């Protein structure tokens, strides 16, 4: 029973850890999308002037 | 298949291309326990110790 | 001449619209960059341990 | 002639805007392709077992 309880606690630790990692990966895509927005709008400024 | 035939033939000559330092046939239970204990994303020097 | 001058004033106003869009886009870039770099904060790291 | 030459330069700038847009779209394609191919990473697989 103690072995089962320890296994469940370890599983929660690893599961939550990987959830934070996938959360960071989504943040990286959001950052890259925002970087493209600024670069795209700076190219539009050249067209406007 | 040419892909799978080449994979098994190269294993004898270049096994280092397939060695994984985290999994190996024959890994001890105590080694599996060690991998679980350092499966988080924030590994301090003291945590690994 | 007066009509065409108003056309010049309109594209100047359209440049101002682009500036506001870029200002908001820059804020998204900075916010997501800060989240990505910080990654796992001290509170989340404490809970996992 | 000078005014119409500016029109040619304007569509050249609009082509440059499209190039920046495609750069962000291509990056999104690669990021999600890598995530889809990777699927379940070793950490998540370890927790489930």
How would you characterize the overall build of this protein?
The PDB classes it as toxin. Keywords: TcA, Insecticide, Translocase, toxin. XptA2 wild type. This is part of a larger assembly, with four copies of chain A (49 residues). Chain A has 49 residues and is mainly alpha-helical. Chain A is built from one helix and no strands. The first copy, chain A, has one helix spanning 2-48. The longest helix of chain A is centred in the middle third of the chain and has 47 residues, at 2-48. The A-D interface holds A 10-11, 14-15, 17-18, 21, 25, 28-29, 32-33, 35-37, 39-40, 43-44, 46-47 and D 10, 13-14, 16-17, 19-21, 23-24, 27-28, 31-32, 35, 41, 43-44, 46-48.
Largest interface: A-D, 21 and 21 residues
Oligomer kind: part of a larger assembly
The fraction of residues in strands of chain A falls at: under 5%
- Give a count of the beta strands of chain A, DSSP E runs of length 2 or more: 0
- Helix and strand content put the structural class of chain A at mainly alpha
Shape of chain A: rod-shaped
Number of helices of chain A: 1
> What's the order of the H and E elements of chain A?
H
Short description:
This is part of a larger assembly, with 4 copies of chain A (49 residues). Chain A is mostly helical.
Main traits of this protein?
49 residues; mainly alpha; 1 helix; part of a larger assembly; 4 chains
Topology:
The structure is cut from a larger assembly and holds four copies of chain A (49 residues).
Chain A: H1 2-48
């Amino acid at each position: 029973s103690l072995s089962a309880t320890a296994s469940q606690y370890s599983a929660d630790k690893i599961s939550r850890s990987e959830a934070y990692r996938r959360r960071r990966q989504e943040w990286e895509i959001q950052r890259d999308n925002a970087d493209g927005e600024v670069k795209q709008m700076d190219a539009q400024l050249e067209s406007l002037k | 298949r040419y892909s799978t035939w080449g994979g098994v033939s190269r294993l004898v000559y270049y096994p280092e291309n397939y060695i994984d330092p985290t999994q190996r046939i024959g890994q001890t239970r105590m080694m599996d326990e060690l991998l679980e204990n350092i499966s988080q994303s924030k590994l301090s020097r003291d945590t690994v110790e | 001449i007066r009509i065409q001058q108003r056309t010049v004033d309109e594209v100047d106003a359209d440049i101002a619209v682009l500036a506001e869009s870029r200002r908001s886009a820059q804020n998204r870039l900075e916010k997501y960059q800060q989240l990505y770099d910080e990654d796992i904060n001290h509170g989340e790291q404490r809970a996992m341990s």
